């Protein structure tokens, strides 16, 4: 309770280009306030929170032998930089 962390980067393709020049996209604690995004963002990666937007998605179509389901809840949020800093290794990475 108060363990700041609240996310998992958007290893997502399309989301790549943004990482590429100025914005970055990730999966975030389905719940964090957008200002929550700004803070986790800022103190976490020592940056400059710019433009913080959000989207959400649940799962559809998972057949399980004799019964079925479709998954849980994956949350999406995108935040941009001010200069183009931080996330380096992450980005060079994927």
């Amino acid at each position: 309770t108060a363990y700041d962390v609240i996310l998992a980067p958007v290893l997502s393709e399309k989301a790549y280009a943004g990482f590429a020049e100025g914005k970055y996209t990730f999966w975030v604690h389905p719940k964090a306030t957008k200002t929550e995004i700004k803070n986790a963002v800022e103190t976490a990666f020592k940056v400059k929170v710019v433009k913080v937007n959000t989207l959400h998605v649940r799962g559809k179509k998972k057949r399980l032998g004799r019964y079925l389901g479709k998954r849980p809840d994956r949350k999406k949020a995108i935040v941009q930089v001010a200069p183009g800093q931080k996330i380096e290794a992450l980005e060079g990475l994927i």
Binding site: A2, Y3, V5, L7, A8, P9, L11, A44
Partner: protein, 67 residues
């Protein structure tokens, strides 16, 4: 790391505070890892979580003792 049980015993306010906080960050590191080293990681994840968990068990014990 029963030994860690010990360190635990050892620290207090702001201490345990930033300890568990930073450690937590560490596990974040893990979260990140969700697609890199991985293999020997496993444990950093499960155990690390158990560890920090303890961290909390303690804070509770101590400040609880308090108020």
């Amino acid at each position: 790391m029963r030994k860690q049980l010990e360190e635990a015993r050892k620290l207090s306010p702001v201490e345990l505070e930033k300890l568990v906080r930073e450690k937590k960050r560490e596990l974040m590191e893990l979260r990140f890892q969700a697609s890199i080293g991985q293999l020997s990681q496993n444990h950093k994840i499960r155990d690390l979580k158990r560890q920090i968990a303890r961290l909390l068990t303690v804070l509770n014990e101590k400040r609880r003792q308090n108020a």
